[PDB]
Amino acid sequence: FERMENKVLDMEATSQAAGELAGFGIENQFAQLEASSGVEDELAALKA
Amino acid sequence: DPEKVLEQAVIDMQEDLVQLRQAVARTIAEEKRTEQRLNQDTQEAKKWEDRAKLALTNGEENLAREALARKKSLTDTAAAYQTQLAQQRTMSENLRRNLAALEAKISEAKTKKNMLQARAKAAKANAELQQTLGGLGTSSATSAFERMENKVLDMEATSQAAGELAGFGIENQFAQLEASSGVEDELAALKA
């Protein structure tokens, strides 16, 4: 049970390890997405 | 591999509870048998006493005391086995709780192990998806797109390269065409 649990912990770590890389470099790009996101919020104010 | 080991442990527990069920049968077999012994024994004691009581009035008195000694000896055997019976009873209910305790252990282990596998397997799948999504074609699709885009830029350059030569030498000739072009403009002035 412990052996296979160790494998679970390993894969768990490896899965969040993909997340570890994913977070550190796309912020540059994401900020541009958020600017665009703000634009439709302004359109909501317009329909009001 | 841990997957294989883990379900093997579940399988082991199924063997274990069967082994304990037959062990229960073994202990209970002795309860039944030891009831049977006491039941016999109590009869035997009475029976030879009965022979002895009549033997008191009839012929040999002395012989009856022998029968009583045998009776009494056997009574001691019965009492000794009554001692053993106590050990049986006590051991039996101990074993009953021990099965129930194991049954709880098995039940929990099985439910735990199942949700353990499921939630782990779900988590890795989510991770695999986030990885493949996260890859974003950054080392494959975009690189292939770029390769063919480089070919586009090459051909684009080559196409304007034909234009590069075309512009530098025909001016000589074009000027003559333009002079002729001016002539029809003068004809337009004439029609006016």
UniProtKB/Swiss-Prot annotation, chain A:
It is found in: Cell inner membrane. Disruption phenotype: Essential, it cannot be completely disrupted. Cells with very low levels of protein have no ordered thylakoids, are barely green and are non-photosynthetic. Belongs to the PspA/Vipp/IM30 family. Required for thylakoid formation. This is Membrane-associated protein Vipp1. The lineage of its organism: Bacteria, Bacillati, Cyanobacteriota, Cyanophyceae, Synechococcales. The chain holds residues 168 to 215 of 267 of the full protein.
Curated annotation (Swiss-Prot), chain B:
Keywords: Cell inner membrane, Cell membrane, Coiled coil, Membrane. Residues 3-133 form a coiled coil. It is found in: Cell inner membrane. GO terms for cellular component: plasma membrane. It is a peripheral membrane protein. Disruption phenotype: Essential, it cannot be completely disrupted. Cells with very low levels of protein have no ordered thylakoids, are barely green and are non-photosynthetic. Belongs to the PspA/Vipp/IM30 family. Required for thylakoid formation. This is Membrane-associated protein Vipp1. The gene is vipp1.
